[PDB]
Amino acid sequence: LADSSAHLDLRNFYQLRDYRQSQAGNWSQGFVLRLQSGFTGGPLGFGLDATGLLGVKLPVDDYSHLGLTAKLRYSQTQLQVGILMPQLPVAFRDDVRLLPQTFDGALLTSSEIEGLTLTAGQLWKSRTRESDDMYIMGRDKAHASDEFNLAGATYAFTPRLSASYYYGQLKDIYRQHYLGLLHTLPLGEGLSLRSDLRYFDSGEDGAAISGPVDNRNLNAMLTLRAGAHAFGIGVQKMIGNDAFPVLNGYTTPYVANLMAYQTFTRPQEKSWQLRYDYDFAGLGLPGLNLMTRYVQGRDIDRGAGRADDSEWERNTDLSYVIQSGPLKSVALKWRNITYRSRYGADLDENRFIVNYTLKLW
């Protein structure tokens, strides 16, 4: 049993919001207990993981759940059945709040052939700190489905160039095709251009119990890395009459212009991003990083014959991984969020998040 391990992930989360068309605060604490067995010896290996989740309001117990995950392994192929945290282009579980969003399902991954990863899965339920079954975020939770089917392939053509295709199907609600092209171009010592191009095509599926689904999503992130600096531009475009479909539960839309508050995927929205990163290591402060980014959106469809909405958001994050002493490896994050829109809400918000992972064995 020496290959087994246990960890406890701790998250302390404080947010001060000023939302209006009101200054309210929130302090809370997350625990994620991860138990992972090793694998039963032999060609076909067997294992068992357990994931325990607890959210506490700051103290009153707010949310708890315990899930198990059976795992099988053979050569380069793995099957997991039970609690899952998928991080896939058509289902990228949320983890920017207190606790990670989880799913129950079965996920098969296989990397038998050099440079090729194949994925096939089915998710049956979504769980968040807030009566299950899945639906498009923003639509009728009464017209839900217990079956999300996914299949994918990623191929590294060269170590500079890889491509990905994924298919997501929420049975009887929607279908989604994803195409991604990732190109990294070296440009001299400490220099590289990362081109991250993404395309989603979303339509209805089966009985279409939540109504029509019409969205194509074109988005790209170009990132110039230079020594300890990084400079990025993002462009994103919603086409069709619908917002970009994601699974309910604040699942993260896998998109270039995703921000701390808004996703910039509203119906017909066109947006661009500027982002700057700095690693302070060279300056003598390893573990300290600055990220600041700004996204501006327009042409947001408000229907009828109304004027389109428009919006902007700025995010500034200062993050610090403590390098030594009793709190070594404790991570701190200060996030400043500023958001304005023409016809909707305005927001100012500060968050302070402390993360730490304790190894139990």
Side-chain angles (χ1 to χ4, degrees):
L1 284 195
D3 296 21
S4 95
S5 56
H7 293 76
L8 175 62
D9 298 324
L10 293 312
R11 181 168 303 164
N12 193 261
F13 190 100
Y14 170 85
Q15 65 153 13
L16 182 49
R17 304 213 331 168
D18 178 342
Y19 172 96
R20 71 288 194 183
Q21 309 282 161
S22 311
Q23 168 155 319
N26 279 128
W27 193 25
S28 60
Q29 173 75 34
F31 301 95
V32 178
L33 173 64
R34 288 179 293 110
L35 268 35
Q36 311 166 90
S37 82
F39 279 95
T40 264
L44 176 70
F46 294 78
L48 185 62
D49 299 335
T51 300
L53 304 87
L54 179 70
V56 299
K57 215 299 167 308
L58 315 164
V60 172
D61 268 46
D62 191 27
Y63 174 81
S64 64
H65 176 72
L66 179 284
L68 301 180
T69 308
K71 57 195 182 185
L72 308 182
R73 203 169 62 173
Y74 181 73
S75 187
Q76 303 297 325
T77 301
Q78 182 156 358
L79 172 68
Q80 305 171 86
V81 188
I83 202 172
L84 301 172
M85 291 176 205
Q87 296 189 233
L88 305 168
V90 301
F92 202 100
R93 84 305 141 36
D94 173 43
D95 189 41
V96 302
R97 297 160 161 72
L98 184 64
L99 293 169
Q101 164 183 35
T102 63
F103 289 82
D104 296 336
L107 190 55
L108 190 279
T109 65
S110 184
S111 305
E112 299 295 336
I113 286 77
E114 288 179 14
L116 178 67
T117 305
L118 301 181
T119 304
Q122 188 183 74
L123 313 180
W124 320 304
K125 36 168 52 66
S126 173
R127 282 196 169 83
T128 65
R129 187 158 76 143
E130 316 78 19
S131 68
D132 292 7
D133 294 346
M134 294 161 294
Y135 55 96
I136 293 163
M137 183 76 279
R139 345 234 297 198
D140 185 4
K141 97 171 111 70
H143 281 186
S145 159
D146 59 6
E147 174 174 340
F148 181 72
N149 294 315
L150 63 88
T154 57
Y155 186 63
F157 285 102
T158 79
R160 274 175 290 102
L161 171 62
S162 59
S164 286
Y165 167 91
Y166 274 86
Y167 176 69
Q169 172 194 49
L170 217 203
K171 196 188 187 306
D172 285 327
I173 295 176
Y174 80 96
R175 282 177 189 230
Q176 184 168 84
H177 296 267
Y178 165 79
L179 196 66
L181 219 167
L182 179 59
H183 184 253
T184 296
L185 174 72
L187 288 171
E189 280 296 55
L191 293 161
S192 66
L193 190 63
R194 182 188 176 84
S195 303
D196 186 346
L197 311 187
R198 301 179 194 176
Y199 178 70
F200 292 94
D201 196 313
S202 294
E204 72 185 50
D205 176 87
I209 58 185
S210 89
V213 177
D214 174 40
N215 179 277
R216 306 193 307 278
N217 171 352
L218 295 42
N219 68 94
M221 192 79 109
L222 260 289
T223 302
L224 181 60
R225 175 63 181 176
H229 308 263
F231 310 91
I233 309 195
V235 293
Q236 185 157 292
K237 183 175 298 75
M238 303 296 109
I239 304 159
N241 85 309
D242 292 319
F244 182 58
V246 285
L247 296 173
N248 65 291
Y250 296 105
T251 312
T252 308
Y254 191 62
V255 305
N257 289 359
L258 171 78
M259 294 283 279
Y261 176 52
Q262 284 303 117
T263 72
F264 288 80
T265 52
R266 291 165 70 167
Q268 296 180 284
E269 187 169 13
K270 292 164 174 158
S271 57
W272 53 266
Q273 169 180 180
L274 297 176
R275 172 178 173 156
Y276 173 70
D277 296 87
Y278 192 65
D279 185 337
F280 283 87
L283 241 57
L285 300 166
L288 187 71
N289 295 275
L290 169 68
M291 188 286 288
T292 190
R293 59 185 176 195
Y294 171 90
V295 172
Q296 181 169 308
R298 63 188 192 278
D299 299 349
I300 298 170
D301 179 32
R302 293 200 304 133
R306 318 178 165 171
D308 300 348
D309 204 353
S310 50
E311 64 190 354
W312 66 261
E313 188 172 332
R314 168 125 38 179
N315 289 165
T316 298
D317 292 342
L318 189 61
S319 94
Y320 187 60
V321 183
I322 296 167
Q323 299 293 293
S324 73
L327 298 180
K328 174 170 193 279
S329 88
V330 168
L332 317 175
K333 187 188 283 293
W334 168 70
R335 317 198 66 181
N336 185 17
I337 300 179
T338 308
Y339 168 82
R340 302 288 187 274
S341 70
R342 177 116 68 95
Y343 296 105
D346 295 342
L347 179 73
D348 293 276
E349 169 167 351
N350 292 269
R351 307 184 183 164
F352 188 77
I353 302 106
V354 178
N355 281 290
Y356 178 71
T357 293
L358 182 81
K359 177 166 89 170
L360 295 181
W361 77 70

PDB file of all heavy atoms in Angstrom, residues 5-12 29-36 95 321 326-332 354-361:
ATOM      1  N   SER A   5      -1.652   7.478  -1.149  1.00  0.00           N
ATOM      2  CA  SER A   5      -1.358   8.769  -0.554  1.00  0.00           C
ATOM      3  C   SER A   5      -2.632   9.446  -0.072  1.00  0.00           C
ATOM      4  O   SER A   5      -3.730   9.125  -0.533  1.00  0.00           O
ATOM      5  CB  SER A   5      -0.583   9.674  -1.527  1.00  0.00           C
ATOM      6  OG  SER A   5      -1.270   9.850  -2.755  1.00  0.00           O
ATOM      7  N   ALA A   6      -2.476  10.367   0.875  1.00  0.00           N
ATOM      8  CA  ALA A   6      -3.583  11.178   1.345  1.00  0.00           C
ATOM      9  C   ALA A   6      -3.172  12.645   1.467  1.00  0.00           C
ATOM     10  O   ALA A   6      -2.071  12.960   1.925  1.00  0.00           O
ATOM     11  CB  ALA A   6      -4.113  10.643   2.667  1.00  0.00           C
ATOM     12  N   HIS A   7      -4.053  13.543   1.045  1.00  0.00           N
ATOM     13  CA  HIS A   7      -3.780  14.968   1.166  1.00  0.00           C
ATOM     14  C   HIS A   7      -5.009  15.703   1.643  1.00  0.00           C
ATOM     15  O   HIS A   7      -6.140  15.245   1.462  1.00  0.00           O
ATOM     16  CB  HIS A   7      -3.330  15.570  -0.166  1.00  0.00           C
ATOM     17  CG  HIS A   7      -2.000  15.078  -0.641  1.00  0.00           C
ATOM     18  ND1 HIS A   7      -1.826  13.832  -1.202  1.00  0.00           N
ATOM     19  CD2 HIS A   7      -0.783  15.674  -0.658  1.00  0.00           C
ATOM     20  CE1 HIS A   7      -0.558  13.678  -1.538  1.00  0.00           C
ATOM     21  NE2 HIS A   7       0.097  14.781  -1.220  1.00  0.00           N
ATOM     22  N   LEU A   8      -4.780  16.848   2.260  1.00  0.00           N
ATOM     23  CA  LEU A   8      -5.864  17.731   2.625  1.00  0.00           C
ATOM     24  C   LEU A   8      -5.570  19.100   2.033  1.00  0.00           C
ATOM     25  O   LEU A   8      -4.573  19.745   2.383  1.00  0.00           O
ATOM     26  CB  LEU A   8      -6.032  17.802   4.145  1.00  0.00           C
ATOM     27  CG  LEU A   8      -7.077  18.790   4.674  1.00  0.00           C
ATOM     28  CD1 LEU A   8      -8.471  18.415   4.177  1.00  0.00           C
ATOM     29  CD2 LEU A   8      -7.040  18.851   6.198  1.00  0.00           C
ATOM     30  N   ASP A   9      -6.429  19.524   1.110  1.00  0.00           N
ATOM     31  CA  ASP A   9      -6.290  20.830   0.485  1.00  0.00           C
ATOM     32  C   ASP A   9      -7.103  21.844   1.278  1.00  0.00           C
ATOM     33  O   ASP A   9      -8.287  21.646   1.517  1.00  0.00           O
ATOM     34  CB  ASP A   9      -6.783  20.799  -0.961  1.00  0.00           C
ATOM     35  CG  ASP A   9      -5.990  19.838  -1.840  1.00  0.00           C
ATOM     36  OD1 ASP A   9      -4.760  19.710  -1.655  1.00  0.00           O
ATOM     37  OD2 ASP A   9      -6.604  19.199  -2.719  1.00  0.00           O
ATOM     38  N   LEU A  10      -6.467  22.934   1.680  1.00  0.00           N
ATOM     39  CA  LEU A  10      -7.139  23.950   2.465  1.00  0.00           C
ATOM     40  C   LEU A  10      -7.285  25.222   1.651  1.00  0.00           C
ATOM     41  O   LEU A  10      -6.322  25.683   1.039  1.00  0.00           O
ATOM     42  CB  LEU A  10      -6.345  24.247   3.746  1.00  0.00           C
ATOM     43  CG  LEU A  10      -6.222  23.156   4.819  1.00  0.00           C
ATOM     44  CD1 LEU A  10      -7.570  22.572   5.111  1.00  0.00           C
ATOM     45  CD2 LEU A  10      -5.268  22.046   4.421  1.00  0.00           C
ATOM     46  N   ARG A  11      -8.482  25.798   1.642  1.00  0.00           N
ATOM     47  CA  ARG A  11      -8.674  27.074   0.964  1.00  0.00           C
ATOM     48  C   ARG A  11      -9.414  28.075   1.822  1.00  0.00           C
ATOM     49  O   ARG A  11     -10.530  27.819   2.251  1.00  0.00           O
ATOM     50  CB  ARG A  11      -9.411  26.912  -0.365  1.00  0.00           C
ATOM     51  CG  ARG A  11      -9.588  28.255  -1.092  1.00  0.00           C
ATOM     52  CD  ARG A  11     -10.055  28.081  -2.538  1.00  0.00           C
ATOM     53  NE  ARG A  11      -9.134  27.251  -3.301  1.00  0.00           N
ATOM     54  CZ  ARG A  11      -9.437  26.693  -4.463  1.00  0.00           C
ATOM     55  NH1 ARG A  11     -10.640  26.880  -4.983  1.00  0.00           N
ATOM     56  NH2 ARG A  11      -8.544  25.948  -5.096  1.00  0.00           N
ATOM     57  N   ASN A  12      -8.787  29.221   2.066  1.00  0.00           N
ATOM     58  CA  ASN A  12      -9.441  30.311   2.782  1.00  0.00           C
ATOM     59  C   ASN A  12      -9.716  31.467   1.823  1.00  0.00           C
ATOM     60  O   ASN A  12      -8.819  31.959   1.133  1.00  0.00           O
ATOM     61  CB  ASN A  12      -8.621  30.762   4.002  1.00  0.00           C
ATOM     62  CG  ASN A  12      -9.410  31.679   4.939  1.00  0.00           C
ATOM     63  OD1 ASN A  12      -9.277  32.902   4.891  1.00  0.00           O
ATOM     64  ND2 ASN A  12     -10.236  31.084   5.794  1.00  0.00           N
ATOM     65  N   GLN A  29     -14.235  28.865   4.359  1.00  0.00           N
ATOM     66  CA  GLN A  29     -13.092  27.970   4.412  1.00  0.00           C
ATOM     67  C   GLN A  29     -13.443  26.630   3.780  1.00  0.00           C
ATOM     68  O   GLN A  29     -14.477  26.016   4.099  1.00  0.00           O
ATOM     69  CB  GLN A  29     -12.634  27.765   5.867  1.00  0.00           C
ATOM     70  CG  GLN A  29     -11.540  26.704   6.047  1.00  0.00           C
ATOM     71  CD  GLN A  29     -10.166  27.193   5.603  1.00  0.00           C
ATOM     72  OE1 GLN A  29      -9.845  28.377   5.741  1.00  0.00           O
ATOM     73  NE2 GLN A  29      -9.353  26.286   5.064  1.00  0.00           N
ATOM     74  N   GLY A  30     -12.574  26.176   2.888  1.00  0.00           N
ATOM     75  CA  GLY A  30     -12.787  24.929   2.196  1.00  0.00           C
ATOM     76  C   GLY A  30     -11.792  23.874   2.625  1.00  0.00           C
ATOM     77  O   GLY A  30     -10.637  24.174   2.957  1.00  0.00           O
ATOM     78  N   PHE A  31     -12.259  22.630   2.621  1.00  0.00           N
ATOM     79  CA  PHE A  31     -11.416  21.471   2.843  1.00  0.00           C
ATOM     80  C   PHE A  31     -11.702  20.471   1.725  1.00  0.00           C
ATOM     81  O   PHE A  31     -12.860  20.190   1.432  1.00  0.00           O
ATOM     82  CB  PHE A  31     -11.741  20.813   4.186  1.00  0.00           C
ATOM     83  CG  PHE A  31     -11.580  21.717   5.363  1.00  0.00           C
ATOM     84  CD1 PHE A  31     -12.666  22.407   5.877  1.00  0.00           C
ATOM     85  CD2 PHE A  31     -10.341  21.868   5.973  1.00  0.00           C
ATOM     86  CE1 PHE A  31     -12.523  23.230   6.995  1.00  0.00           C
ATOM     87  CE2 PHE A  31     -10.184  22.694   7.083  1.00  0.00           C
ATOM     88  CZ  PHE A  31     -11.275  23.374   7.594  1.00  0.00           C
ATOM     89  N   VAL A  32     -10.651  19.947   1.101  1.00  0.00           N
ATOM     90  CA  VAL A  32     -10.799  18.852   0.158  1.00  0.00           C
ATOM     91  C   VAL A  32      -9.836  17.753   0.552  1.00  0.00           C
ATOM     92  O   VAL A  32      -8.616  17.917   0.470  1.00  0.00           O
ATOM     93  CB  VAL A  32     -10.551  19.275  -1.317  1.00  0.00           C
ATOM     94  CG1 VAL A  32     -10.675  18.065  -2.255  1.00  0.00           C
ATOM     95  CG2 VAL A  32     -11.510  20.380  -1.739  1.00  0.00           C
ATOM     96  N   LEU A  33     -10.405  16.646   1.011  1.00  0.00           N
ATOM     97  CA  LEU A  33      -9.650  15.495   1.436  1.00  0.00           C
ATOM     98  C   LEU A  33      -9.510  14.547   0.254  1.00  0.00           C
ATOM     99  O   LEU A  33     -10.502  14.055  -0.282  1.00  0.00           O
ATOM    100  CB  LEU A  33     -10.366  14.804   2.602  1.00  0.00           C
ATOM    101  CG  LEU A  33      -9.792  13.470   3.066  1.00  0.00           C
ATOM    102  CD1 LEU A  33      -8.388  13.648   3.624  1.00  0.00           C
ATOM    103  CD2 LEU A  33     -10.704  12.824   4.100  1.00  0.00           C
ATOM    104  N   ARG A  34      -8.273  14.310  -0.164  1.00  0.00           N
ATOM    105  CA  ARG A  34      -7.999  13.430  -1.294  1.00  0.00           C
ATOM    106  C   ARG A  34      -7.279  12.166  -0.835  1.00  0.00           C
ATOM    107  O   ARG A  34      -6.150  12.225  -0.346  1.00  0.00           O
ATOM    108  CB  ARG A  34      -7.161  14.163  -2.350  1.00  0.00           C
ATOM    109  CG  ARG A  34      -7.931  15.219  -3.115  1.00  0.00           C
ATOM    110  CD  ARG A  34      -7.067  15.949  -4.147  1.00  0.00           C
ATOM    111  NE  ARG A  34      -6.038  16.770  -3.511  1.00  0.00           N
ATOM    112  CZ  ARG A  34      -4.736  16.496  -3.535  1.00  0.00           C
ATOM    113  NH1 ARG A  34      -4.292  15.426  -4.182  1.00  0.00           N
ATOM    114  NH2 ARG A  34      -3.876  17.300  -2.922  1.00  0.00           N
ATOM    115  N   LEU A  35      -7.948  11.027  -0.967  1.00  0.00           N
ATOM    116  CA  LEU A  35      -7.333   9.741  -0.667  1.00  0.00           C
ATOM    117  C   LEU A  35      -7.118   9.038  -1.993  1.00  0.00           C
ATOM    118  O   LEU A  35      -8.029   8.990  -2.815  1.00  0.00           O
ATOM    119  CB  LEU A  35      -8.246   8.916   0.238  1.00  0.00           C
ATOM    120  CG  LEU A  35      -8.111   8.969   1.767  1.00  0.00           C
ATOM    121  CD1 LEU A  35      -7.717  10.334   2.300  1.00  0.00           C
ATOM    122  CD2 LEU A  35      -9.394   8.464   2.447  1.00  0.00           C
ATOM    123  N   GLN A  36      -5.915   8.532  -2.235  1.00  0.00           N
ATOM    124  CA  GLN A  36      -5.655   7.836  -3.492  1.00  0.00           C
ATOM    125  C   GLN A  36      -4.889   6.563  -3.203  1.00  0.00           C
ATOM    126  O   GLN A  36      -3.813   6.599  -2.612  1.00  0.00           O
ATOM    127  CB  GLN A  36      -4.858   8.697  -4.481  1.00  0.00           C
ATOM    128  CG  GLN A  36      -5.389  10.107  -4.703  1.00  0.00           C
ATOM    129  CD  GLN A  36      -4.377  10.993  -5.422  1.00  0.00           C
ATOM    130  OE1 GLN A  36      -4.359  11.074  -6.651  1.00  0.00           O
ATOM    131  NE2 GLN A  36      -3.523  11.649  -4.657  1.00  0.00           N
ATOM    132  N   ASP A  95     -13.162  25.848 -10.474  1.00  0.00           N
ATOM    133  CA  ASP A  95     -12.379  25.862  -9.236  1.00  0.00           C
ATOM    134  C   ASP A  95     -11.880  27.250  -8.854  1.00  0.00           C
ATOM    135  O   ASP A  95     -10.844  27.377  -8.211  1.00  0.00           O
ATOM    136  CB  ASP A  95     -11.174  24.912  -9.294  1.00  0.00           C
ATOM    137  CG  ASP A  95     -10.491  24.757  -7.922  1.00  0.00           C
ATOM    138  OD1 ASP A  95     -11.214  24.669  -6.906  1.00  0.00           O
ATOM    139  OD2 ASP A  95      -9.245  24.719  -7.859  1.00  0.00           O
ATOM    140  N   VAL A 321       3.708  32.628  -3.513  1.00  0.00           N
ATOM    141  CA  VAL A 321       3.960  31.362  -2.859  1.00  0.00           C
ATOM    142  C   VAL A 321       5.083  31.544  -1.837  1.00  0.00           C
ATOM    143  O   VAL A 321       6.237  31.817  -2.191  1.00  0.00           O
ATOM    144  CB  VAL A 321       4.342  30.266  -3.855  1.00  0.00           C
ATOM    145  CG1 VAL A 321       4.518  28.932  -3.121  1.00  0.00           C
ATOM    146  CG2 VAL A 321       3.277  30.147  -4.966  1.00  0.00           C
ATOM    147  N   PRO A 326       7.693  28.504   8.470  1.00  0.00           N
ATOM    148  CA  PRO A 326       6.604  27.625   8.904  1.00  0.00           C
ATOM    149  C   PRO A 326       5.428  27.559   7.917  1.00  0.00           C
ATOM    150  O   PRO A 326       4.698  26.582   7.944  1.00  0.00           O
ATOM    151  CB  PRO A 326       6.151  28.269  10.218  1.00  0.00           C
ATOM    152  CG  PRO A 326       6.609  29.676  10.130  1.00  0.00           C
ATOM    153  CD  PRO A 326       7.903  29.618   9.412  1.00  0.00           C
ATOM    154  N   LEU A 327       5.249  28.579   7.079  1.00  0.00           N
ATOM    155  CA  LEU A 327       4.155  28.589   6.108  1.00  0.00           C
ATOM    156  C   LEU A 327       4.669  28.344   4.692  1.00  0.00           C
ATOM    157  O   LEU A 327       4.005  28.683   3.709  1.00  0.00           O
ATOM    158  CB  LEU A 327       3.392  29.915   6.193  1.00  0.00           C
ATOM    159  CG  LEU A 327       2.733  30.142   7.567  1.00  0.00           C
ATOM    160  CD1 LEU A 327       1.978  31.463   7.623  1.00  0.00           C
ATOM    161  CD2 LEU A 327       1.828  28.958   7.923  1.00  0.00           C
ATOM    162  N   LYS A 328       5.867  27.770   4.595  1.00  0.00           N
ATOM    163  CA  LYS A 328       6.447  27.406   3.303  1.00  0.00           C
ATOM    164  C   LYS A 328       5.454  26.626   2.443  1.00  0.00           C
ATOM    165  O   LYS A 328       4.849  25.654   2.904  1.00  0.00           O
ATOM    166  CB  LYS A 328       7.728  26.580   3.504  1.00  0.00           C
ATOM    167  CG  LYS A 328       8.341  26.013   2.226  1.00  0.00           C
ATOM    168  CD  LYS A 328       9.731  25.424   2.513  1.00  0.00           C
ATOM    169  CE  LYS A 328      10.500  25.140   1.225  1.00  0.00           C
ATOM    170  NZ  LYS A 328      10.070  23.855   0.611  1.00  0.00           N
ATOM    171  N   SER A 329       5.316  27.065   1.193  1.00  0.00           N
ATOM    172  CA  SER A 329       4.428  26.472   0.185  1.00  0.00           C
ATOM    173  C   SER A 329       2.980  26.931   0.312  1.00  0.00           C
ATOM    174  O   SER A 329       2.156  26.588  -0.531  1.00  0.00           O
ATOM    175  CB  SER A 329       4.493  24.936   0.149  1.00  0.00           C
ATOM    176  OG  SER A 329       3.570  24.368   1.084  1.00  0.00           O
ATOM    177  N   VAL A 330       2.661  27.683   1.366  1.00  0.00           N
ATOM    178  CA  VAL A 330       1.359  28.353   1.425  1.00  0.00           C
ATOM    179  C   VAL A 330       1.274  29.403   0.316  1.00  0.00           C
ATOM    180  O   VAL A 330       2.184  30.213   0.153  1.00  0.00           O
ATOM    181  CB  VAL A 330       1.119  29.045   2.781  1.00  0.00           C
ATOM    182  CG1 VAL A 330      -0.096  29.965   2.706  1.00  0.00           C
ATOM    183  CG2 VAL A 330       0.952  28.010   3.879  1.00  0.00           C
ATOM    184  N   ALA A 331       0.183  29.389  -0.441  1.00  0.00           N
ATOM    185  CA  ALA A 331      -0.001  30.323  -1.539  1.00  0.00           C
ATOM    186  C   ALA A 331      -1.016  31.401  -1.199  1.00  0.00           C
ATOM    187  O   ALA A 331      -2.112  31.111  -0.707  1.00  0.00           O
ATOM    188  CB  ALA A 331      -0.443  29.565  -2.811  1.00  0.00           C
ATOM    189  N   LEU A 332      -0.663  32.649  -1.484  1.00  0.00           N
ATOM    190  CA  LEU A 332      -1.569  33.769  -1.252  1.00  0.00           C
ATOM    191  C   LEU A 332      -1.960  34.364  -2.586  1.00  0.00           C
ATOM    192  O   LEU A 332      -1.132  34.447  -3.496  1.00  0.00           O
ATOM    193  CB  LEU A 332      -0.903  34.854  -0.382  1.00  0.00           C
ATOM    194  CG  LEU A 332      -0.091  34.394   0.840  1.00  0.00           C
ATOM    195  CD1 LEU A 332       0.617  35.563   1.539  1.00  0.00           C
ATOM    196  CD2 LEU A 332      -0.975  33.626   1.802  1.00  0.00           C
ATOM    197  N   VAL A 354      -6.235  32.065   0.358  1.00  0.00           N
ATOM    198  CA  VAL A 354      -5.066  31.346   0.848  1.00  0.00           C
ATOM    199  C   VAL A 354      -5.238  29.862   0.566  1.00  0.00           C
ATOM    200  O   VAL A 354      -6.208  29.243   1.009  1.00  0.00           O
ATOM    201  CB  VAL A 354      -4.845  31.567   2.362  1.00  0.00           C
ATOM    202  CG1 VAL A 354      -3.638  30.761   2.867  1.00  0.00           C
ATOM    203  CG2 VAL A 354      -4.653  33.049   2.657  1.00  0.00           C
ATOM    204  N   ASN A 355      -4.299  29.295  -0.176  1.00  0.00           N
ATOM    205  CA  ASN A 355      -4.342  27.881  -0.498  1.00  0.00           C
ATOM    206  C   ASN A 355      -3.211  27.137   0.179  1.00  0.00           C
ATOM    207  O   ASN A 355      -2.087  27.637   0.254  1.00  0.00           O
ATOM    208  CB  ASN A 355      -4.234  27.671  -2.013  1.00  0.00           C
ATOM    209  CG  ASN A 355      -5.538  27.932  -2.731  1.00  0.00           C
ATOM    210  OD1 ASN A 355      -6.489  27.168  -2.607  1.00  0.00           O
ATOM    211  ND2 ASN A 355      -5.585  29.008  -3.495  1.00  0.00           N
ATOM    212  N   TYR A 356      -3.494  25.930   0.651  1.00  0.00           N
ATOM    213  CA  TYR A 356      -2.437  25.083   1.149  1.00  0.00           C
ATOM    214  C   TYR A 356      -2.802  23.615   1.075  1.00  0.00           C
ATOM    215  O   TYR A 356      -3.931  23.224   1.376  1.00  0.00           O
ATOM    216  CB  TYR A 356      -2.067  25.450   2.589  1.00  0.00           C
ATOM    217  CG  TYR A 356      -1.000  24.544   3.139  1.00  0.00           C
ATOM    218  CD1 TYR A 356       0.309  24.623   2.672  1.00  0.00           C
ATOM    219  CD2 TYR A 356      -1.297  23.602   4.115  1.00  0.00           C
ATOM    220  CE1 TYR A 356       1.290  23.789   3.166  1.00  0.00           C
ATOM    221  CE2 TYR A 356      -0.320  22.763   4.615  1.00  0.00           C
ATOM    222  CZ  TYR A 356       0.971  22.861   4.135  1.00  0.00           C
ATOM    223  OH  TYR A 356       1.942  22.022   4.622  1.00  0.00           O
ATOM    224  N   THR A 357      -1.835  22.801   0.681  1.00  0.00           N
ATOM    225  CA  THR A 357      -2.037  21.364   0.645  1.00  0.00           C
ATOM    226  C   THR A 357      -1.166  20.661   1.683  1.00  0.00           C
ATOM    227  O   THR A 357       0.062  20.730   1.641  1.00  0.00           O
ATOM    228  CB  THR A 357      -1.775  20.800  -0.756  1.00  0.00           C
ATOM    229  OG1 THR A 357      -2.785  21.289  -1.655  1.00  0.00           O
ATOM    230  CG2 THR A 357      -1.784  19.261  -0.733  1.00  0.00           C
ATOM    231  N   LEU A 358      -1.827  20.002   2.623  1.00  0.00           N
ATOM    232  CA  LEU A 358      -1.157  19.219   3.652  1.00  0.00           C
ATOM    233  C   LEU A 358      -1.048  17.766   3.212  1.00  0.00           C
ATOM    234  O   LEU A 358      -2.051  17.165   2.813  1.00  0.00           O
ATOM    235  CB  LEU A 358      -1.983  19.285   4.926  1.00  0.00           C
ATOM    236  CG  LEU A 358      -1.452  18.575   6.164  1.00  0.00           C
ATOM    237  CD1 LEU A 358      -0.406  19.459   6.853  1.00  0.00           C
ATOM    238  CD2 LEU A 358      -2.602  18.258   7.104  1.00  0.00           C
ATOM    239  N   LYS A 359       0.151  17.193   3.275  1.00  0.00           N
ATOM    240  CA  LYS A 359       0.320  15.778   2.950  1.00  0.00           C
ATOM    241  C   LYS A 359       0.078  14.929   4.188  1.00  0.00           C
ATOM    242  O   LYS A 359       0.793  15.054   5.175  1.00  0.00           O
ATOM    243  CB  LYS A 359       1.708  15.481   2.364  1.00  0.00           C
ATOM    244  CG  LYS A 359       1.919  13.988   2.080  1.00  0.00           C
ATOM    245  CD  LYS A 359       3.136  13.690   1.204  1.00  0.00           C
ATOM    246  CE  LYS A 359       4.404  13.495   2.029  1.00  0.00           C
ATOM    247  NZ  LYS A 359       5.529  12.973   1.196  1.00  0.00           N
ATOM    248  N   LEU A 360      -0.941  14.079   4.150  1.00  0.00           N
ATOM    249  CA  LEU A 360      -1.244  13.228   5.294  1.00  0.00           C
ATOM    250  C   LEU A 360      -0.371  11.975   5.307  1.00  0.00           C
ATOM    251  O   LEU A 360      -0.030  11.472   6.382  1.00  0.00           O
ATOM    252  CB  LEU A 360      -2.727  12.863   5.339  1.00  0.00           C
ATOM    253  CG  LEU A 360      -3.675  14.044   5.560  1.00  0.00           C
ATOM    254  CD1 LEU A 360      -5.112  13.584   5.605  1.00  0.00           C
ATOM    255  CD2 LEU A 360      -3.307  14.764   6.848  1.00  0.00           C
ATOM    256  N   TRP A 361      -0.002  11.479   4.126  1.00  0.00           N
ATOM    257  CA  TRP A 361       0.903  10.330   4.024  1.00  0.00           C
ATOM    258  C   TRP A 361       1.231   9.946   2.586  1.00  0.00           C
ATOM    259  O   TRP A 361       0.853  10.644   1.643  1.00  0.00           O
ATOM    260  CB  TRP A 361       0.361   9.109   4.793  1.00  0.00           C
ATOM    261  CG  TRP A 361      -0.748   8.352   4.111  1.00  0.00           C
ATOM    262  CD1 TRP A 361      -0.645   7.580   2.988  1.00  0.00           C
ATOM    263  CD2 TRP A 361      -2.116   8.269   4.528  1.00  0.00           C
ATOM    264  NE1 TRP A 361      -1.867   7.032   2.677  1.00  0.00           N
ATOM    265  CE2 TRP A 361      -2.787   7.444   3.605  1.00  0.00           C
ATOM    266  CE3 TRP A 361      -2.841   8.816   5.592  1.00  0.00           C
ATOM    267  CZ2 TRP A 361      -4.145   7.156   3.712  1.00  0.00           C
ATOM    268  CZ3 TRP A 361      -4.191   8.530   5.696  1.00  0.00           C
ATOM    269  CH2 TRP A 361      -4.827   7.705   4.764  1.00  0.00           C
TER     270      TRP A 361
END
